Amino acid sequence: MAELTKITRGMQNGAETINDNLNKLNTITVQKTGDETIAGKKTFSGDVSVDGDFTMKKFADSYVAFFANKGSGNTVTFTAPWDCTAE
Amino acid sequence: PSGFNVVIEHDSEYQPDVKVTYYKNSIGTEANGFDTGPVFGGERIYNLASSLSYIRNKINVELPSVYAMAGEVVNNGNELLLINGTEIMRFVIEGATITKGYVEKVKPPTNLIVSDVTSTSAKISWENG
């Protein structure tokens, strides 16, 4: 993702370009410690566990759905919004 | 004269130690550009024997005359670098910050002799450094 400048034999400011690439990587990467803010759509292939306080926006919009018949109340007909379990 | 003298100006009110090393073709000093030298990272590092003397805020690093070299002076605060092409002479200070560093060009006078001394006068004579 990050834009690093290529390190080649014979290049002019080798030490300085290596320093800038190391500094770029150090400030753009998500690290295993400290509080941070991460931008972009993050898709996780494997399992994810949150030991701390998990915060998610709009949980009831996202995970619950209520469908009922107004005019009759005997036959509810609906198009499922996502893969679910009905009660 | 006495030798090759490098002056290191610092912020301590005391006598900081200085350690001198010499090395060729460290990163950024190779003639044909980055990593074009014979030993990537730098050739043999030699410890240079120095004789140090101090005045407030100024260390004078006296090295044998044989090491005398020209070159750009780089001040990195923790260390001073005397860069001459491919060659580097590195000076590492301990317990202070390098303010300014340079090869001593204006050198102090030497053979001070007091002659023609009377009750009211004397003649002071010397020799250029």
Neighbouring residues of B119: CB distance < 8 A, sequence distance ≥ 6: none
DSSP A49-81: --SS----S-HHHHH------SSSSS------S
Quick one: B71 and B101 in the same domain? Answer: yes
- Chain A closest-CA separation from residue B30 CA (Å): 9
* Whether B71 and B111 share a structural domain: no
| CB-based contact B75:B83 (threshold 8 Å) | no
CA–CA gap between residue A12 and residue B28 (Å, rounded)? 8
Question: Which experimental technique did the depositors report for determining this structure?
Answer: X-ray
Residues of A in contact with B34 (CB under 8 A): 7-15
Are B124 and B55 in contact by the 8 Å Cβ rule? The answer is no
Same domain, B46 and B91: yes
Based on the domain organization, do B38 and B95 belong to the same domain? yes
Length of chain A (residues): 87
Residues B65 and B89 in one domain: yes
Judgement on whether residues B17 and B73 belong to the same structural domain of the protein: yes
Residues B81, B116 within the same domain: no
For this entry, resolution in Å reads 2.9
Both B30 and B76 in a single domain?
A: yes
Both tokens of B119, joined, read 């009750």
Q: How many domains does chain B have?
A: 2
Q: Which residues of B touch A (CB under 8 A)?
A: 27-28, 32-36
CA dihedral B41, B42, B44, B45 (to 10 degrees): -90
A10 CB neighbours in chain B (<8 A) are 32-36
Using CA of residue B76, residue B79, residue B81, residue B86, what is the dihedral sign?
Answer: negative
Beta-bridge partner residues of B60:
B7, B53
Looking at the structure, do residues B100 and B112 belong to the same domain, yes or no?
no
Q: Tell the burial category of B99 from Cβ atoms under 10 Å away from its Cβ (0-12, 13-18, 19+).
A: middle
> Whole-angstrom Cα distance, residue B21 to residue A67?
81
- Show the tokens assigned to B72: 């750009």
Report CA B8 to chain centroid distance, whole Å.
Answer: 7
Round to whole Å and give the CA distance between B88 and B37. Answer: 14
Q: Which of B27, B28, B33 sits opposite A10 (nearest CB)?
A: B33
Do B86 and B31 share a structural domain? yes
Q: How far is CA B32 from CA A79, B65, B89, B95, in A?
A: 71, 29, 20, 37
- Is B30 found in the same domain as B62? yes
Same domain membership, residue B22 and residue B10: yes
Distance, in Å, from the CA atom of B7 to the CA atom of A60, rounded to the nearest integer, reads 73
Domain interval for residue B65: 1-106
